[PDB]
Ligand binder design. Structure first.
Ligand SMILES: Nc1ncnc2c1ncn2[C@@H]1O[C@H](COP(=O)(O)OP(N)(=O)O)[C@@H](O)[C@H]1O
Ligand SMILES: Nc1ncnc2c1ncn2[C@@H]1O[C@H](COP(=O)(O)OP(N)(=O)O)[C@@H](O)[C@H]1O
Lengths: 490, 501
């Protein structure tokens, strides 16, 4: 757990030392009161002291509950929100909400199929009020000062000594990945060591900078999260989300028939859908969807890992290239065409197939085939199914494995939002899944195992471009989750 | 210089080929109705169809004129707004603005020297209104369907055939920089050709990928803008803002005393402040501030160029390294300490000094000094001034050339806002500078020479032992091609192509 001197490591500075930070920090309401976890907790603590503001937060928490409610419980939530916050026989808790908006809610909640978006305008108007005088007043409170103290701690130096380095978990191209624990909080992570000599030999400079950047831009429950970055004399280290449930390749082959029950594949595909949507919201194309790249956690939840090939596509632009893994590349990828997010939707089709069948759609397990031929199979050969796949599972795979990207499921403008509407995900509540409220079908088994160069000045010019050390939101979450925020804030 | 068949090149698709776009476009008001120039023009066109919506636009535009108003004109400008939008109880054009917001506005406008932010809460409420039902209604309009058509044109292929290639402008480190023109619009750009063989030999893959990204991320009148990106069998090409007026090194030395008047230098330093503010709000540290890296345009406005060394710093993180040019590196840099944006404020100090004096602060012109000794001067020696400097110029240099970054001007929690507040800038109205309403003291003369030439030929270099393999293709895959949205949309409007379609 926590170290003996944890309170000395995580000691808040005096408020006077936070003066530079106070004036320099951009006074953005969405960031400081919502997106930054400590900021959100402290603004809510401030609201708790003002009765009118406390009701606004309760209303937002009630709307969040409604948004994640089960279909047979949604109308009860909605009616409850109306009774508690818009009781006409009582005064107005939320006066700034226009009567026409209140009225529209009452009408949308009469309908037997109520829109999970029924309170969005009420929500938007509530935040408009909060980002005004309440936000101004919060900035002049003791709670904001406390937020600035945490913000100061957050920018404190990060070195190998911030962690305890345990057993090697795996071996990569640029080095090894080992299990590490933050000394101050006891939080466990995966420390991916990228050896400087290995980066130089394999020309992985642009790659390393890219992964780093991609991992910090993405804020997803289904994508491996970067919490820290540091440098040693030998390596550039990435401190990532620990996934000790093994990769999907291990579960399909080493523990599989090969393959596993449809219900699992469907659950994993649902999560992969959300991960892809999270990446696509950031205009990122993953490029290397394969079982070996999907990892499982202790709870049985998955995350996309290996973001080396992932690339951000600016608006009004396309990428090209035959990149990825032989057998997983989309027709446009093997044809070296100009494309955007289409390869990922194809990749999902490959994954669902491999999970159910027990081999990739255009390459058998172990199969000794030249790359040159696997590419022709991707371009021309069709994929044969079995009664391992339900009629719905055969449909999502057929739609995702369509050769022409413009006719492919998820590439016709509907995006992940559309892919989610497929009849395979009938039994799945995506709002609950996206909120970590759905239990996985399977859970990994505890105890059980699941798995000449000389540095010069041009290398120094590459290390200068590498920033250290902590990642803001993941760090603030670690502070809250570990109990350190509670035991210091009190 | 529009194409003959320009209307054929810029043909809008039917609103069926845009059905895809309509469902995949994130409905963000700030992006679709403000940041994106064509989205902004089309939502404003939709607003003209509704008198209440038309009034909100009139108000936002009136507040925008208030903000850029000269110090004497401002009070009467403010009063006219009050007179047009808040003086009638039964005929209120903006009813959703609470009377308490209007009360605070009238208070701060009653006094002499009113805040240029007097209508900032009024503006916030007007946008909250527009971001609601008017925005939802806009999404079902014919005006929004046109936006989807323009967005489809923007995603259309870009190659070497999109441009007319003109004269070579200069010799870059990775290839030729030449004057090029978009065929369909006739707009002139500078096409930086980065040779595939030169990038390989120099190991500039990370650098090229980073430069591209930074140029698309920054939206500044004071930073060279990337408008397009395309690929050739032998090069990666960046289509950039054409800067005919030459660089600052040429103006300081070649046609300078060495140096030029304080009045010019101060205008450049003010424009540089804006550029550095723009880079910092995108969390970027430029790192290579030096005269040759600041270019002039045909009107006499400057822009920070060569964003090769520029680094984006994630929040709560720091960079290190002794990088940049010898004589221009800050103490934290020479000592290889961990830092953020401090080297850029030191850099502004080095620039102001050189422009006024005629040589860098710790190295005389063309002096043969060992880099190690140059570093020692940067760390210990204090820069000497002359009578070429007014009292306020010496003040800005001494504060920007503070050895300890924690004591340096711009680095103490005040940023660019605090630097802009320095007495040297008393004669500059920053709101007008940022809005491009200030005329520069110096304007380049056409027919006059502003750079070293450069024969209008070649591209040729040392390419022996260089072979493009699989690893190179793995890098080209990462380089996206096409246009850069905001630059592209501005170009469509400026060229009149949007107006004539
Ligand atoms: N986040 C993580 N949690 C647990 N183990 C992890 C991990 N990230 C990587 N690993 C392990 O380290 C091995 C190598 O890391 P990897 O990312 O696959 O390197 P690579 N394929 O680019 O060469 C992985 O195959 C896996 O066994
Ligand atoms: N945006 C631009 N507009 C007009 N001319 C430009 C330009 N960017 C570069 N040039 C010209 O090409 C020359 C070399 O470009 P440069 O920025 O130094 O490329 P680099 N850093 O790889 O050496 C400049 O000195 C200038 O003459």
């Amino acid at each position: 757990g926590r170290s003996k001197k944890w309170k000395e490591i995580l000691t808040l500075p005096p408020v006077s030392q936070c003066s530079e930070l106070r004036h320099s920090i951009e006074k953005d309401y969405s960031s400081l009161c919502d997106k930054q976890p400590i900021g959100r907790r402290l603004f809510r603590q401030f609201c708790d002291t003002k009765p009118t503001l406390k009701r606004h937060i309760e209303f937002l928490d009630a709307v969040a509950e409604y948004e994640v409610a089960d279909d047979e419980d949604r109308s009860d939530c909605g009616l409850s929100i109306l009774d508690r916050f818009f009781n006409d026989k009582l005064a107005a808790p939320l006066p700034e909400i226009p009567p026409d908006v209140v009225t529209e809610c009452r009408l949308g909640l009469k309908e037997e199929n109520p829109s999970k978006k029924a309170f969005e305008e009420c929500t938007r108007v509530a935040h408009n009020y909060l980002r005004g005088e309440p936000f101004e007043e919060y900035q002049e409170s003791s709670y904001f000062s406390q937020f600035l103290q945490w913000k100061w701690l957050e920018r404190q130096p990060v070195t190998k000594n911030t962690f305890r380095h345990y057993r090697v978990l795996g071996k990569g191209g640029f080095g090894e990945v080992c299990a590490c624990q933050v000394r101050a909080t006891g939080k466990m992570y995966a420390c991916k060591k990228l050896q400087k000599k290995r980066i130089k030999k394999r020309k992985g400079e642009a790659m390393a900078l890219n992964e780093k950047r991609i991992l910090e831009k993405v804020q997803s429950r289904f994508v491996v999260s970067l919490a820290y970055a540091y440098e040693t004399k030998d390596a550039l280290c990435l401190v990532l989300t620990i996934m000790n449930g093994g990769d999907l390749k291990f579960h399909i082959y080493n523990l599989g028939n090969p393959g596993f029950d449809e219900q699992r594949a469907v659950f994993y595909a649902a999560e992969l859908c959300c991960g892809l949507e999270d990446l696509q919201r950031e205009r990122i194309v993953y490029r290397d969807l394969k079982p070996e790249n999907i990892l499982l956690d202790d709870r049985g939840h998955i995350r996309i890992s290996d973001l080396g090939l992932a690339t951000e596509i600016p608006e009004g632009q396309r990428v090209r290239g035959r990149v990825g893994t032989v057998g997983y590349m989309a027709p446009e990828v093997v044809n070296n065409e100009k494309y955007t997010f289409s390869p990922d939707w194809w990749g999902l089709g490959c994954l669902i197939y491999e999970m159910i069948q027990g081999h990739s759609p255009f390459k058998k397990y172990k199969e000794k085939v030249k790359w040159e031929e696997v590419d022709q199979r991707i371009k021309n050969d069709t994929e044969e199914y079995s009664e391992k796949f339900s009629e719905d599972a055969k449909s999502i795979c057929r739609m995702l494995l369509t050769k022409n990207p413009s006719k492919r499921l998820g590439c016709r403008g509907e995006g992940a939002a559309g892919v989610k509407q497929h009849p395979v995900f009938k039994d799945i509540n995506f709002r609950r899944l996206e909120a970590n409220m759905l239990e996985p079908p399977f859970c990994p088994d505890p105890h059980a195992v699941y798995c000449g160069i000389y540095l010069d000045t041009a290398d120094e010019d590459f290390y200068a471009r590498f920033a250290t050390g902590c990642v803001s939101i993941p760090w603030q979450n670690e502070m809250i989750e570990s109990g350190c925020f509670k035991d210091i804030n009190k």
